[PDB]
Each structure stands twice: as C-alpha cells, then as structure tokens.
Amino acid sequence: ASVERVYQKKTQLEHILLRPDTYIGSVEPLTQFMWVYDEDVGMNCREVTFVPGLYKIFDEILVNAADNKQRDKNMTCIKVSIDPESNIISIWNNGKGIPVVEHKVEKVYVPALIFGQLLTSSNYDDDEKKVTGGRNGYGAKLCNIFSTKFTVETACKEYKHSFKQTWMNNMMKTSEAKIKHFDGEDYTCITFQPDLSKFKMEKLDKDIVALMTRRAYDLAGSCRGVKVMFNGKKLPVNGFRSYVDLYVKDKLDETGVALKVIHELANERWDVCLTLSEKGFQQISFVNSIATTKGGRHVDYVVDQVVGKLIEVVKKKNKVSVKPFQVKNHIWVFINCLIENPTFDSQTKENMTLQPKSFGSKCQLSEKFFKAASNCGIVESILNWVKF
C-alpha cells in the first residue's frame, strides 16, 4: 500500500458518512429492553430492535421543534406525522418561523444556511444562558445527510415571506428555494424520507415507529405549554405528572401493593417524581426535552439528595452499615429539568455532563418530599435487608 493509500484525509461530509457513530449513534441494529408506545398496548417495556441512528435523526428534528418554544414563548403546538408506507415523516411547529432573508455574511437565505451547511446554529453565543437542547450546529444537517429527501418549509410574518427548499440524496442535491409572500400565522415544517439503506432497513417497522411515537409522548410530558399531536390526534398528556402516570399509575410492587409515587415541582425548572424500584436503579430523565438515556449530573444531583435523607431515616432504625448504592438500587426516579447551556459527551446527548454549580438553578427538595419518600417502600426494602 502506498503512502497516499495508507494516510488519508476526509472532508467533514465524508467523515459523517464514514464514521456515523459519533454523530448519530450506531447505524446497525440494536436489541434492548426499553419503553415504547405500541399501537396495541400503549406504553410498555419490552425488547425492541431498532437502529439508533435512525431514532436520532428523528430526535434531532423533534428537539429542534421543542427548542422553538424558547425563541417564541407563544408557541403552542408540535404535530408529528409518520407514514411507513410512503416513508415520510413530518414535524411541524407553530410560533415564530425562521427569518426568510439573505444572511449578509454567508450570502444565502438563513434557512438554507442552517439546514444545508454544517456547523450552523443560533446556539453558539453562550453569554445567552439558554435552555434549548440545541448546542452544536449539527442536528438538522445530520437528518438531511441521512435522508433521501429533506424539505424545509418555514413562514415568518415579520419578514413577509415563506420559504420552501428540498434537498435530496443525502444533502448532495438541491434546487432553488421557493420564496412567496406570507402574512399569516408563522410555522416551520420539516418533512423527510430517511435513507433506510444507510440503516440496512426496508421499511419503518413497528419497533422504530413505537419508539418515535414514545418520543412524542415524552415531549407532551416534558415541554411545558406545548401540545403534541401524533398522526392527527392530540396526545392526552398535559404535563409531567400525567406523563409519569403512563409508567407507574397501574403498577404494583412484588407484594401486590400499588406503587406509591411522590412528586414535587421544586421550581419551574425542576419536576421530580419518585417511587420504588424492584429491578435495580432506574431513571427516566429529560434535559431541555432531550431524553438523557444514560443519565448525567442532573440525575445524580437529585438522587444523591434522596439517598442522603433516606440513609438518615434508615439509620434511626438500624441500631448494619447501609451503603448508598444499596439505597439507589431501590429508586425509580423521573426528572424533567431545564439546564442552562448543558454539555454532553456526544452529539447524541445521552449523558449530560455539566456540573450542578453551572446549571443556572437548584433543585432543593422539600422536607415534605423527603418524608413522603420515606413512605414509598424504599426504607422498608432496605431495613428488611438489614436483617440479612
């Protein structure tokens, strides 16, 4: 092999297709137990087989829609549509559209810049302490790159125009945008056909659809003040507590007693529910409407408080040494939080790494919450084990 064959340079766009894993996650199938929203049983925990990268390109567009609530607090609605037969996904939101105007530095229309060029974002000035999920300037381009067709439609009354542009063939082909007079209610709609060949798939199957559907339920629970519709029907979830009920309202512990679920909205930025786990530590958490499926410092921050107080309670009845990991082993925690300028160790944002001192707010759970936590069966489970 010559020097030029061994030592190679790639462009950024080449690198994304060659090394998708750090951008969107694995492009190969994964089987694991997780929660999905199925057509027959609704929310349930089962083995699911799906391609992470396909989940993530959908998630990037969904979180971008949620992020628009920060740009326009008057936004009220996100509508998600998935048609497996035609292979078309659309995510629509109201509130302010994107300025339909030429960027005076980049010399292209703003929507074309931020959907068609890498490393473009409204989230690069961190002196603005924002609680958007967007941070890196990649997500929408990654969806475009992994789509055979990707259409951006946006209408912005302030600029008196609507914009529609379509990319094809993994963001490699496009054509002139359609610009028209607009004076109505603003919106943005992203419509895409995922490139299933990139994921070794023939069709959007039941498992990936059930996962994407569950993300829409997540958003109904996590994004305050935004209603979510899925395939033309409003999701009947009106806040985080009602979302948590989808997991725990009909569940019993192993002794046949209903799970006792405790809740506190500590402040606008921290919503916490807690109950007993009999399957080891479990957390369901969102940072800025991102599902932090590997957790992070926000989970540790909440859990450590509970663990500390419950250790105190057990100690007043253990006259041996009960260890924090043993207490955490019995906790199922649900957290919805808003973090200023969060950091993550990957574009997929599964693990939120920002230290609590930088969150921009605190979650100081009340003594009433801690007393309630001491009554949800965790203390009993620890004490019963102190006999062994």
Ligand X SMILES: CCCc1cc(=O)oc2c(C(=O)N3CCCc4ccccc43)c(OCCN3CCN(C)CC3)ccc12
State the binding site for ATP.
Answer: 64, 93, 121-123, 134-141, 347-349
Residue 376 contacts ligand X per CB under 6 A: no
309: its two tokens: 């107080």
Residue 121 contacts ligand ANP per CB under 6 A: yes
Nearest residue (CB) to a copy of itself, 65 versus 110? 110
Residue 81 contacts ligand ANP per CB under 6 A: no
Nearest residue (CB) to a copy of itself, 213 versus 285? 285
Q: For residues 114 and 98, is the Cβ–Cβ distance under 8 A?
A: yes
Nearest residue (CB) to a copy of itself, 336 versus 348? 348
Measured at the CA of 207, the angle between CA 206 and CA 213, to 5 degrees, comes to 85
Residue 25 contacts ligand ANP per CB under 6 A: no
- The footprint of a copy of itself on residues 324-383 (CB under 8 A) is 325, 329, 343-348, 350, 353-355, 358
Residue 140 contacts ligand ANP per CB under 6 A: yes
Q: Which CB contacts under 8 angstroms, 24+ apart, belong to 351-360? A: 351/292, 351/294, 351/295, 351/296, 352/287, 352/290, 352/292, 352/295, 352/296, 352/297, 352/298, 353/296, 353/297, 354/296, 354/297, 355/297, 356/297, 356/298, 356/301, 359/298, 359/301, 360/129, 360/131, 360/269
- The footprint of ligand X on residues 196-225 (CB under 6 A) is 218
Residue 285 contacts ligand ANP per CB under 6 A: no
Instruction: Please list the residues that pair with 274 across neighbouring strands.
Output: 262, 333
Chosen residue from 275, 289, 292, 381 binding ligand X by CB under 6 A: 292
282: its two tokens: 């479990």
Residue 252 contacts a copy of itself per CB under 8 A: no
DSSP letter at 124 equals -
Q: For residues 74 and 84, is the Cβ–Cβ distance under 8 A?
A: no
128: its two tokens: 């603005």
Number of residues that bind Mg ion (CB under 5 A): 3
193 is in the binding site of which of ligand X, Mg ion, a copy of itself, none (Cβ under 5 to 8 A by kind)? none
Site of interaction with ligand X (CB under 6 A): 25, 33-35, 45, 52, 55, 218, 279, 282-285, 291-293
Site of interaction with a copy of itself (CB under 8 A): 3-12, 15, 18-19, 21-22, 25-26, 28-30, 99, 101, 103-106, 110, 113-114, 117, 119-122, 124-125, 135-137, 279-280, 294, 323, 325, 329, 343-348, 350, 353-355, 358, 384-385, 387-388
